[PDB]
Amino acid sequence: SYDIQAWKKQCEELLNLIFQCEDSEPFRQPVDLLEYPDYRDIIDTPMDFATVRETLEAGNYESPMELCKDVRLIFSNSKAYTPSKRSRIYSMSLRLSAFFEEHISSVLSDYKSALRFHKRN
C-alpha cells in the first residue's frame, strides 16, 4: 500500500470525524484573545482544528507528521491552560486526543512505509 500521497485524504477524513465529535467543540476555532487576555502570556503558539484543516487544504503540510505535531499542540496547549485535571475542557481534550492517536497511527505507518518503498533501490 505504497501511495505517498494517500495521507492527505486520510487526514481530511479524520478531521471530519473530529469535527463530528462533541468533544472537539472547544478546539474547533482559535481561542478568543479578548475573552482570555492572559491566554497570550500562557500559550506562545495558539492552535485549533480549523487552522489545521486550512493549513492542510492550502497544501502547507509536506507530511502527516507535521499535521500530527500541530494537532498534538492543541492538546498540550489545553494541558497547560487547565488549572485542574478534573476540568470539563481538559477532560474533553484527553478523550479527543485518545481518538486522534487511535486513528493517526495507521496514517503515519502507511506514509513512512510508502516513503521507504520509494527509496528501496
Ligand X SMILES: O=C(NCc1ccccc1)N1CCN(C(=O)c2ccco2)CC1
Please give the residue ranges that form the binding site for ligand X (CB under 6 A). Answer: 25-26, 29, 31, 78, 81-82, 87, 89-90, 93
Nearest to 74 by CA among 105, 48, 52, 102: 48
Contact between residue 10 and residue 111 where contact means Cβ atoms under 8 Å apart: no
Q: In the complex, what is the shortest distance from the CB of residue 9 to ligand X, in angstroms, rounded to a whole number? A: 27
Q: In the complex, what is the shortest distance from the CB of residue 103 to ligand X, in angstroms, rounded to a whole number? A: 21
Nearer to ligand X, 10 or 77 (CB): 77
Q: In the complex, what is the shortest distance from the CB of residue 51 to ligand X, in angstroms, rounded to a whole number? A: 12
Nearer to ligand X, 26 or 63 (CB): 26
Contact between residue 56 and residue 65 where contact means Cβ atoms under 8 Å apart: no
Q: In the complex, what is the shortest distance from the CB of residue 110 to ligand X, in angstroms, rounded to a whole number? A: 30
In the complex, residue closest to ligand X by CB:
78
Nearer to ligand X, 79 or 118 (CB): 79
CA dihedral 107→62→47→100, nearest 10 degrees, is 0
Instruction: State the Cα–Cα distance between residues 110 and 48, nearest whole angstrom.
Output: 25
Q: What are phi and psi of 85, to 5 degrees?
A: -90, 10
